[PDB]
Amino acid sequence: GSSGSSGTGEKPYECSVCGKAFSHRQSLSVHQRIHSGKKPSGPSSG
Binding site for Zn ion (CB under 5 A): 15, 17-18, 20
Q: Which is nearer to Zn ion, 39 or 45 (CB)?
A: 39
Minimum distance between the CB of residue 15 and Zn ion, rounded to whole angstroms? 3
Q: Which is nearer to Zn ion, 10 or 18 (CB)?
A: 18
Contact 31, 17 (CB under 8 A): no
- Please give the sequence-ordered ranges of beta strands (E in DSSP) within 1-46, or none if there are none: 13-14, 21-22
Task: Give the CB-nearest residue to Zn ion.
Answer: 15
Strand, helix or coil for residue 23: coil
